[PDB]
Design an enzyme around this catalytic site. Structure first.
Site, PDB file in Angstrom:
ATOM      1  N   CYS A 102      -4.328  46.617  15.815  1.00 56.07           N
ATOM      2  CA  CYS A 102      -5.038  45.393  15.472  1.00 56.07           C
ATOM      3  C   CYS A 102      -5.542  45.394  14.030  1.00 56.07           C
ATOM      4  O   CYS A 102      -6.116  46.377  13.565  1.00 56.07           O
ATOM      5  CB  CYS A 102      -6.207  45.176  16.438  1.00 56.07           C
ATOM      6  SG  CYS A 102      -7.136  43.666  16.113  1.00 56.07           S
ATOM      7  N   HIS A 138     -12.809  40.416  17.805  1.00 58.19           N
ATOM      8  CA  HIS A 138     -11.586  41.155  18.084  1.00 58.19           C
ATOM      9  C   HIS A 138     -10.662  40.402  19.047  1.00 58.19           C
ATOM     10  O   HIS A 138      -9.461  40.305  18.807  1.00 58.19           O
ATOM     11  CB  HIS A 138     -11.854  42.546  18.654  1.00 58.19           C
ATOM     12  CG  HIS A 138     -10.637  43.151  19.280  1.00 58.19           C
ATOM     13  ND1 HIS A 138      -9.620  43.711  18.533  1.00 58.19           N
ATOM     14  CD2 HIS A 138     -10.228  43.205  20.570  1.00 58.19           C
ATOM     15  CE1 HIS A 138      -8.658  44.119  19.343  1.00 58.19           C
ATOM     16  NE2 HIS A 138      -9.001  43.821  20.584  1.00 58.19           N
ATOM     17  N   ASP A 160      -5.312  26.915  25.107  1.00 57.51           N
ATOM     18  CA  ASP A 160      -6.740  27.160  24.949  1.00 57.51           C
ATOM     19  C   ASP A 160      -7.227  27.882  26.187  1.00 57.51           C
ATOM     20  O   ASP A 160      -6.691  27.675  27.277  1.00 57.51           O
ATOM     21  CB  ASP A 160      -7.518  25.846  24.823  1.00 57.51           C
ATOM     22  CG  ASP A 160      -7.733  25.161  26.172  1.00 57.51           C
ATOM     23  OD1 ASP A 160      -6.834  24.422  26.615  1.00 57.51           O
ATOM     24  OD2 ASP A 160      -8.795  25.371  26.800  1.00 57.51           O
ATOM     25  N   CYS A 204      -7.802  43.270  12.807  1.00 53.91           N
ATOM     26  CA  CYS A 204      -9.071  42.557  12.684  1.00 53.91           C
ATOM     27  C   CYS A 204     -10.148  43.418  12.035  1.00 53.91           C
ATOM     28  O   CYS A 204     -10.041  44.642  11.994  1.00 53.91           O
ATOM     29  CB  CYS A 204      -9.537  42.008  14.037  1.00 53.91           C
ATOM     30  SG  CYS A 204     -10.605  43.073  15.038  1.00 53.91           S
ATOM     31  N   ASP A 209     -11.698  17.806  24.359  1.00 57.53           N
ATOM     32  CA  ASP A 209     -11.332  17.423  25.719  1.00 57.53           C
ATOM     33  C   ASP A 209     -12.033  16.120  26.103  1.00 57.53           C
ATOM     34  O   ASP A 209     -12.861  15.614  25.340  1.00 57.53           O
ATOM     35  CB  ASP A 209     -11.581  18.561  26.716  1.00 57.53           C
ATOM     36  CG  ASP A 209     -13.023  19.026  26.745  1.00 57.53           C
ATOM     37  OD1 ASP A 209     -13.933  18.238  26.429  1.00 57.53           O
ATOM     38  OD2 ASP A 209     -13.254  20.192  27.116  1.00 57.53           O
ATOM     39  N   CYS A 233     -11.763  46.246  14.208  1.00 55.04           N
ATOM     40  CA  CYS A 233     -10.971  47.460  14.399  1.00 55.04           C
ATOM     41  C   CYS A 233     -10.856  48.290  13.121  1.00 55.04           C
ATOM     42  O   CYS A 233     -10.509  49.469  13.165  1.00 55.04           O
ATOM     43  CB  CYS A 233      -9.595  47.118  14.969  1.00 55.04           C
ATOM     44  SG  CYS A 233      -9.703  46.521  16.680  1.00 55.04           S
TER      45      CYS A 233
HETATM   46 ZN   LIG Z   1      -9.324  44.237  16.569  1.00 59.29          ZN
END
Ligand SMILES: [Zn+2]
Ligand SMILES: O=c1[nH]cnc2cc3nc(NCc4cccs4)[nH]c3cc12
Ligand SMILES: O=c1[nH]cnc2cc3nc(NCc4cccs4)[nH]c3cc12
Ligand SMILES: [Zn+2]
Lengths: 368, 368
Positions: free
Chosen positions: B303, B334, B265, B305, B93, B308
């Site tokens: 999920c 996560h 973002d 990830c 930015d 998880c």
């Molecule tokens: Zn997750």
């Protein structure tokens, strides 16, 4: 399948030993350093990262956990291993040490200690450690403050030995615990040789899987600690692990191994890491110091850890100064890795019969 | 070898587009979500973890960095990529937005903004972004506060367009930057259609590699934001990326993609993660809530990830309540992973001509 508990000594040099403890959840290489998990986490590290540093076992503080989430809740959730995601051995403390340290309005008696969160008895302590699913259980004792008069050290030690027997009986009365976990006793007696001897005799008569040296690293300083270790460690059964509670600095560890200690724990690498202190083979540095602001070298020039492979002193300096979480993560990973590399060098040097030389070389450089 | 900048649209559905931005440091899949790096770190995550979530590019805030360590220092150390250990594209930015937000005693003029750390001109902003080694450079603008009168919105927009031309010239005057980085212009004009049109015309006349929609997500609410996007986005060149600054919540992202936005973002997944808010396909939850204290399910049931796969709601609940660093680490990983999975589902659905259906299905479940 591995046994409940088997300590084997592979090599010796003077009083120093190297070997392994085999347990159901894994093998522990000795001399061992145990990273400290407070509130079911080794601070700022995933368990896989703790393992990546070389740790075979962690220490789980029970004090905060017995308050929140509570031992019963953790048991309901499947135990500490499942809860935090560490599947290897965990040694749990009794919870009594930090009760005296962190609680208020504590009241002591022969039954145990009553306290207000910021009654814990030997029986309750063993039960809590069971509910957590501890692999190595510590007897509930009393750490005698330093300095202590001979009379007070004696009274304190005597109570601890009575509590050790109660801990033993509680542990043995629970079939699942007795069959799957190990129990360590804790020697007391302050700095007094005769009391240390009486304590060792009492513990050996009761019988434990391992023996801790308690009552040290409580303000006496290294010279006095080493002096006490000189006579205290040979009093313990030779064929069982020796655990020096709360130690310590790298030089303390080396000297303690020279005196027959097999196991160590301390918050120093984790706690001081978050504060900015990084361990190197040329001694500790404080990464916050302005001299590191443009230093592109890793924390330590020889360290094999992931932090030293990827990031500069300059970057970690910036993170710690900025109060960034990643700063704590990187410092802690490096410090724990440094400790594990130290233990590996200690083990290798004993195995090769050159530990005395290693200790000399280590000190000469670390304190240059 | 990849070009300096090439945006290709692979598939469309209504106003929605999916495709890629190719740059020297990597390929960016669009629509894209950019995790925010503040003070040269995506909070509580190693760069490898950020990449593991699926991120192709991160946003580097320049405001804190230009203060400490300073743009010049970072340049001396090899640039932001080397400094923080992220080798893929970084969008920076201009620094002006947070100057107005975080600084005190700010003084504005046609030259730029003068401020006291808690003079920044278009030329200095572009130079700072160069010193950091930015891949996508943002023109220095002025975000008009909401609400704004037509007169004030016009004056603000006009200044921003003058600053956009100055940003363009500064960027082009620096050979290394012009050859290796890209420059995005920022549309202003508040909620007023005529001013948005004038701003788009001015930016297209100057010419940029990409076009941001500025002046939104500043208190107007989703209905008004969507209404402004409805007429504002089609004013921008179709063949260049469209970046909605500071957005946002999952539902905001979906609606914005429906209106032609390619890039996003926000600090929401990182910031609110550390606070306890976890995103799920059934809507956000606050992990601090007592109802999660014994919940063994992962944060989200679908999920993919690492968090998880390994840890329960109960454990993360405990960590966040205890103020543990690992809590922030797991929540942030996560949440960022959830955002990336959302972007992937958006990209896949557009590619398959079923994005409209996905948006409907997403909302029905997320707000059930
Ligand atoms: Zn997750
Ligand atoms: O006799 C002990 N019994 C049970 N736990 C202990 C823990 C110990 N931790 C230290 N020193 C490290 C410190 C931690 C806090 C203040 S000093 N010394 C210790 C001694 C004992
Ligand atoms: O016109 C803009 N120009 C340059 N940067 C921006 C950043 C922006 N961030 C938000 N919203 C998210 C927020 C961040 C802090 C308060 S609201 N809206 C934004 C608009 C602009
Ligand atoms: Zn290292």
């Amino acid at each position: 399948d591995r046994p409940r508990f088997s300590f084997s000594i592979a090599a010796r040099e003077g009083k120093a030993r190297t070997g392994t403890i085999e347990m159901k959840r894994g093998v522990i290489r000795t001399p061992a350093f145990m990273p400290v998990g407070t509130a079911a986490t080794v601070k700022a590290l995933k368990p896989e990262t703790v393992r990546a540093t070389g740790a075979d076992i962690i220490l789980g503080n029970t004090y905060h956990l017995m308050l929140r989430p509570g031992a019963e809740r953790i048991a309901k959730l499947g135990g500490l291993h499942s809860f935090m995601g560490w599947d290897r051995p965990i040694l749990t403390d009794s919870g009594g040490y930090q009760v005296m340290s962190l609680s208020s309005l504590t009241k002591q008696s022969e039954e145990g200690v009553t306290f207000k969160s910021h009654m814990l008895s030997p029986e309750r302590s063993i039960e809590i450690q069971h509910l957590l699913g501890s692999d190595i259980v510590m007897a509930f004792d009393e750490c005698t403050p330093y300095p202590a008069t001979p009379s007070r050290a004696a009274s304190s030690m005597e109570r601890s030995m009575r509590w050790a027997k109660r801990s033993r009986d509680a542990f043995d009365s629970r079939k699942e615990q007795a069959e799957n976990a190990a129990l360590f006793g804790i020697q007391q007696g302050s700095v007094f040789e005769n009391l240390r001897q009486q304590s060792a005799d009492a513990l050996a008569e009761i019988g434990f899987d391992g023996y801790a040296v308690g009552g040290l690293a409580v303000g006496e300083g290294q010279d006095e600690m080493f002096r006490v270790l000189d006579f205290s460690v040979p009093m313990l059964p030779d064929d069982k692990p020796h655990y020096l509670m709360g130690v310590g600095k790298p030089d303390d560890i080396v000297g303690a191994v020279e005196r027959g200690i097999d196991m160590f724990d301390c918050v120093l690498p984790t706690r001081s890491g978050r504060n900015g202190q990084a361990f190197t083979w040329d001694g500790p540095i404080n990464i916050r110091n302005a001299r590191f602001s443009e230093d592109l070298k890793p924390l330590d020039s020889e360290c094999h850890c992931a932090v030293c492979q990827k990031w500069s002193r300059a970057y970690i300096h910036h993170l710690i100064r900025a109060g960034e979480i990643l700063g704590a993560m990187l410092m802690t990973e490096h410090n724990i890795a440094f400790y594990q590399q130290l233990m590996q060098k200690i083990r290798d040097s004993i195995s090769e019969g050159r530990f005395s030389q290693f200790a000399q070389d280590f000190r000469a450089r670390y304190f240059a």
